[PDB]
Design a protein around this ligand. Structure first.
Ligand code: MPG
Ligand code: MPG
Ligand code: MPG
Ligand code: MPG
Ligand code: MPG
Ligand code: CL
Ligand code: CL
Ligand code: HG
Length: 289
């Protein structure tokens, strides 16, 4: 039944297109106007922090692969900690006030986690892009400009970070939105440096690589629109979407980032980066309040 694979392909494609487009459409309804406001501003702060990091690449231009793998692990560790403490744990509390505490509330967040993996896995199959380890991925990718493939890798990476900012603001609760957005925005400064350096390395002169890195940061306000929309349809959509954004980010770290550091032989340097970034975000979870 190749009809069945065509049916699943149609449902898969429409399901990811629908999530993104219906998220934006739902975000733009009148009931969400205040929440979208906070979420896009949070996203625009991440764009600004990305821009700042990218500007710092004009000085460095290129770095040892060992240093690059450390910095990628560092940003990755910050995002694992942001997923755990700024999305999963508040999602648990939010779920508990809707369905009751205990494992039933964890089931809300856990199902969202799985939905986030499925969304990113589907985008990973349908979006042509390229990694320096496994080469080009996605439909028709072998005959796509290689710089553009790497740009799309960066776009896929930052979609969940934008979505997380949107989800965290979906109820107007700055107690949730500010810690999450602070974590992503601080992480975006080293990340903008890594992105500009990686774009330079795939063939752009440093000045154009910096400008493309700055433009890539616009995925965070855009993804924040998606996050607002998917998290606001009904009361449970909010803790489910917390888990969804967390699972999408965890996929980016474990599927997109950490594998790039392992096959170069710098598993050990990436690991010290992961530990430091995770520890740092824990600290900032309590120092920033
Ligand atoms: C990489 C992914 C990029 C996706 C590209 C974006 C695709 C979406 C393009 C245009 C969407 C326009 C939505 C306007 C919403 C109208 C709701 C108007 O509000 C209303 O209907 C009432 O207020 C209800 O309360
Ligand atoms: C509420 C959460 C919704 C999340 C959506 C999850 C459902 C889809 C999840 C994963 C889809 C992966 C399918 C793999 C496609 C195989 C090559 C397909 O590549 C191709 O060749 C195409 O023909 C190109 O268009
Ligand atoms: C607020 C955001 C402002 C930023 C606006 C975006 C600025 C975009 C800047 C530069 C993009 C131009 C790319 C240069 C050609 C790349 C060829 C690379 O491919 C090649 O090596 C050969 O051409 C192969 O075809
Ligand atoms: C919401 C997030 C939006 C993010 C937008 C990112 C904008 C990035 C802008 C330009 C990417 C430059 C790489 C393209 C390589 C092909 C150059 C073109 O090759 C060429 O040289 C022409 O064929 C001849 O001039
Ligand atoms: C409470 C919420 C639960 C959330 C669960 C998310 C945590 C799981 C995240 C990452 C698992 C580790 C991924 C790396 C694969 C390790 C062996 C992979 O082995 C291999 O195949 C390669 O050769 C080496 O990497
Ligand atoms: Cl990351
Ligand atoms: Cl250069
Ligand atoms: Hg980084």
């Amino acid at each position: 039944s190749h009809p069945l694979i065509t049916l699943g392909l149609a449902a898969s494609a429409a399901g990811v297109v629908l999530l993104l487009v219906a998220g934006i459409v739902n975000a733009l309804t009148g009931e969400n106007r205040v929440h979208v406001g906070y979420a896009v501003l949070g996203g625009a702060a991440g764009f600004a922090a990305t821009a700042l990091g990218a500007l710092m690449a004009l000085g460095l231009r290129a770095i040892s692969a060992r240093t690059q793998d450390a910095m990628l692990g560092f940003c990755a560790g910050m995002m694992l900690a942001a997923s755990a403490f700024s999305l999963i744990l508040p999602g648990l509390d939010a779920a508990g006030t809707i369905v009751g505490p205990g494992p039933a509330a964890a089931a809300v967040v856990a199902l969202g986690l799985g939905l986030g993996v499925l969304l990113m896995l589907g985008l990973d199959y349908f979006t042509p892009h390229e990694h320096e380890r496994t080469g080009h991925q996605g439909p028709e990718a072998a005959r796509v400009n290689r710089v553009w493939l790497f740009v799309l890798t960066i776009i896929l990476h930052n979609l969940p970070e934008g979505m997380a900012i949107g989800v965290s603001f979906a109820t107007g609760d700055l107690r949730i939105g500010l810690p999450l957005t602070s974590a992503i925005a601080i992480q975006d400064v080293p990340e903008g440096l890594c992105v500009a350096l990686a774009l330079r390395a795939v063939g752009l002169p440093i000045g154009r690589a910096v400008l493309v890195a700055v433009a890539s940061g616009l995925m965070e306000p855009l993804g924040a629109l998606v996050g607002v929309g998917i998290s606001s349809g009904f009361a449970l959509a909010y803790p489910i979407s917390m888990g969804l954004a967390a699972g999408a980010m965890i996929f980016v770290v474990s599927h997109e980032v950490i594998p790039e550091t392992h096959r170069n032989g710098h598993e050990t340097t990436a690991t010290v980066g992961l530990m430091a970034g995770f520890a740092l975000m824990m600290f900032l979870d309590t120092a920033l309040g």
